[PDB]
Copies of this chain bind each other. A is one copy, B any other.
Amino acid sequence: EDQNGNKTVMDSDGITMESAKDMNLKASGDINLEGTNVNIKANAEFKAEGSAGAEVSTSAVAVLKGSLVQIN
């Protein structure tokens, strides 16, 4: 833990990280996330990009919703 309110804890509930201001994860290679359930939330905006394409897929049901949905 630091003096600015940033904190990392490893315990019986897994690994928790909190930031006082922001968080930047970078790699020169690939970034791979895995888990049973992946939940991403934003209180303002969510964006995702790929210079060579992007894909969302599932074996069951894909869902796209909003008050307005635009495609190209």
**A contacts, CB < 8 Å to B:** 2, 4, 6, 8, 10-72
Contacts and interface: CB of A to CB of B under 8 A. Distances in A.
A41 to B, nearest CB: 5
A20 B31 contact: no
Contacts of A30: 22-23, 35-39
Number of copies: 2
A45 B35 contact: no
Given A4-B12, A31-B35, A32-B24, A54 B50 contact: no
Nearest to A23: B27
Nearest to A16: B24
Contacts of A68: 60-62
A61 B47 CA distance: 12
